[PDB]
Amino acid sequence: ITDSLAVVLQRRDWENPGVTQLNRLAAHPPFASWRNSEEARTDRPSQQLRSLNGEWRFAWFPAPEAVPESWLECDLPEADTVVVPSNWQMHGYDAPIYTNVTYPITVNPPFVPTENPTGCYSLTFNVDESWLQEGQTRIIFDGVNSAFHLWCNGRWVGYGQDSRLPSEFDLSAFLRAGENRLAVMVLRWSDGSYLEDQDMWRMSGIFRDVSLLHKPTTQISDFHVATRFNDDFSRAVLEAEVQMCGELRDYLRVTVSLWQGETQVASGTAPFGGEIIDERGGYADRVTLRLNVENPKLWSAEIPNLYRAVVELHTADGTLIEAEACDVGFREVRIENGLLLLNGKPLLIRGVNRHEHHPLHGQVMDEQTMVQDILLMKQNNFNAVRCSHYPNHPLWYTLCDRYGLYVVDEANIETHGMVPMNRLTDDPRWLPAMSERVTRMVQRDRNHPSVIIWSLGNESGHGANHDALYRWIKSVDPSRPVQYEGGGADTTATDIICPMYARVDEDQPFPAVPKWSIKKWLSLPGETRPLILCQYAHAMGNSLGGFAKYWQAFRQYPRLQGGFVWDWVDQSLIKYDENGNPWSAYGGDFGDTPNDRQFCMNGLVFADRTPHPALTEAKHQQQFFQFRLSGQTIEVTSEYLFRHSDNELLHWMVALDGKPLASGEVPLDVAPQGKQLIELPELPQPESAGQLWLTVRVVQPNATAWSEAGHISAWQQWRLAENLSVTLPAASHAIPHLTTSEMDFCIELGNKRWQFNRQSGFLSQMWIGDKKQLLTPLRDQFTRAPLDNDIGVSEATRIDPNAWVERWKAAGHYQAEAALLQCTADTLADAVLITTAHAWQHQGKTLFISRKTYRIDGSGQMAITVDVEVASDTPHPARIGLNCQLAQVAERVNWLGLGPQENYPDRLTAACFDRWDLPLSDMYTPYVFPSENGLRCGTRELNYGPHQWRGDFQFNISRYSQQQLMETSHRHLLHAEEGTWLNIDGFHMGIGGDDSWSPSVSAEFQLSAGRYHYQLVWCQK
Ligand SMILES: CC1(C)C(/C=C/c2ccc(O[C@@H]3O[C@H](CO)[C@H](O)[C@H](O)[C@H]3O)cc2)=[N+](CCCCCCCC(=O)O)c2ccccc21
Ligand SMILES: [Mg+2]
Ligand SMILES: [Mg+2]
Ligand code: NA
């Protein structure tokens, strides 16, 4: 009759933001309904919390009206068997859509398309007869994207929205003895989708755990854990509020126990009945228990000391009815005099935004991937994670509790694609839907100590609903600051100025929502709050240029307390090719249109969690140990707030142009915020030529729960003495001969022979024996394969004239062909010298001039001098150097300069100067969107096979031309070219990365001088 699909779907509850659930139970902290209290303290499994994960029957429909009525009674024969949890896009049933701002549906709230992909999950399962005669049996859906109706045994149970928070329903009256059948109809789109416009893949399905929980009729319905402290934290009080449902009776009592290991630290017991709260009395169904704790071990990210609270509901005669439990971190979060304090000390947030993404399972996470992310974060000096932009899987907070990470729990509210952004969040008709997303988050995660900051959501402007919900959290949970960046990052709905992509020194004064410089932002009249960037340093491919500038500002300004880098993972997806070889897909690679292509990849680690090179630049800048050194005394400073360096030694080394001369390892016993001065022993000071470099590293001898033994926590380098080569070079035993063609200038000397084309003006090729050496003439280069930062949002459709790639193209940097002006040759006693002079023009105007002279002496060496002019009105070049295609292909590359990893001018602080030797594999960075990559800076010795270059240059080297990288869109479509492409540059523009839609390379890294000069020397070996 009434459990019909006809009647249920007729309500169209998914096109009505006033109905966000039906018959859904109240929210609460994680429950397990342990019937034994030692089971609760131990955090065992519980015989009352069954998992329904596993094999379900699934069938896909284009619209819920297409679902046959029989599906409520029987299984559909057309249905496949599917593992749950699952995003059905990852099973291939329809495409995942990657859109950023633009809604994947027609913006017509509260309505959704008639084409509403419907996933009809079903599951036949058994229930013990004990669950049917006593108690309450409920089903828990931890995550259903994006809304669903629930049937059990053909009868309709309820409805749910908000896809990142659990939905629980009472099944007691619906369950049969023996076999039962669930039928959950998941809708891809709902009115809740208008609040779920996060910049991510748009997936759907039952993508989190499903569970049965059995509880007694008399039950713990909710419990809150609070910890107040005294002046110096030597004494804490743990307040525990416990609420019950069921038959209230005079013999019912509640005990709350606090443990740490096998030690019961405290406990108290009381009957129900709270304090009088107003004229009608108090809450008879509640009670508050206060437990004193002398010298409590405090919870930090540095030391995640956890107690365990056990909540026993029992009778006076001692019959245990039910037990719940939670981990407890003794920690106080407050903002005082403008600073965010944790346990009275000012935090410095080494944060990152982290989406729930897995390249194969989509948005279906587990435990191994979560622990892998957490280990990788702490191993790269990260103390905080923002759950951008929704409540995470419950296990995530438990893990940050234990491994020690500060967490910003963010409500599942983003209306980015609305025009304006506060069209829904300022509408009071949407306040209920938004309140449910906020209140149910707090009701779920309020006992997790790792949660230090509540967030109202992301990119939804500033509306009155934000103010109402901000004030609701402050009233319900004073334990935590509330932050929200929408509407200009400093509205009345945030305790923290939390801008996204605000720059350090540069004002971006957009109307109504200016992104002021973070330094200036603090200074604004009447402004007193701390500033923690909700998002900063857009790590889209080759990026994080200018990252050190942020952390200089963080350390110099007290109220600049850090921020969360955007972001942790590439949201790459996995496709399969001709032969089933996997490759990384991004926007549009599933036929999804419209889409925002590579903007789904902003991580410091690839989707497989392999690191990008920018990761160690973050690790270096966010390291907890700062170093100064005067002469021989290293000043090392702890930026830890709670721990001594009781598992850290400093290894030190001093090396002249690579070769080590002195080792050493002295222990470190620096106090939190303290200092320690280490006198270095008599370091050797040789009269030898070259630069002497000191390198100190902080090494953890013992294994942590997040590192292995020997892990490096921090490092720093200084150039000590440098003695300049004063020696007159070793005399020659031969004079090279010059040969003047009508077309060529050719020089010869033993094995070596060089050939300059007098019509081109370039070194066309050189010889060693009967073995050719070049496949392309050694020519200039003023361009690079554009990085995602140079492209920005520029597409073939809508072009971004302000983007760097478009300023270059419009001036003809890529179409510029050389036009030779002078190319001589002269016989000198010591050598032969050809001087060239090329000009680059496009549509008339001469952009660049490059006067060179090459000097091949008895030397066996070839001295190239380059003196480049660049017009004062052409856009600054991305590069000023040379490139050529080597015939040689060698297995290893050795160089003297900053390494070992990729590094660029505005991203080289993590690199160290040394002699580095890697396979050619690692001199190319496999950015999924190919670009310029693998560059090493500060280099003046490069050894590849028989060749050797020296000067003071920057170089990248691999199998890929930079017009192949430019004309290719996916890494898996690149093929090794014949030979080896090498770009040698005396200068190279920075990569930028404060954001990836505006030019973000600061003036000091723009090739803007006008005249330029570098010197290379080519030689065999
Ligand atoms: C300023 C700029 C670069 C621009 C930039 C808009 C812009 C940039 C970024 C953005 O969202 C950002 O995208 C990131 C992707 O990794 C992250 O999600 C980040 O959290 C988020 O803030 C949202 C909008 N548009 C693209 C506009 C598309 C519609 C978006 C909303 C702006 C509007 O229409 O008012 C044009 C178009 C022509 C010239 C210049 C521009
Ligand atoms: Mg609805
Ligand atoms: Mg957005
Ligand atoms: Na993005």
Curated annotation (Swiss-Prot):
Highest taxon above the source species: Bacteria
Recorded GO CC terms: beta-galactosidase complex
Cofactor note as given: Binds 2 magnesium ions per monomer. Can also use manganese. Binds 1 sodium ion per monomer.
Binding site for Mg(2+) 1: 414, 416, 459
Active site positions: 459 (proton donor), 535 (nucleophile)
GO terms for biological process, alphabetical: lactose catabolic process
Effect of residue 997 to F/G/L/T: Decreases affinity for substrate
Positions of substrate binding: 100, 199, 459, 535-538, 602, 997
Subunit structure comment from the entry: Homotetramer.
UniProt name for this protein: Beta-galactosidase
Species per Swiss-Prot/TrEMBL record: Escherichia coli (strain K12)
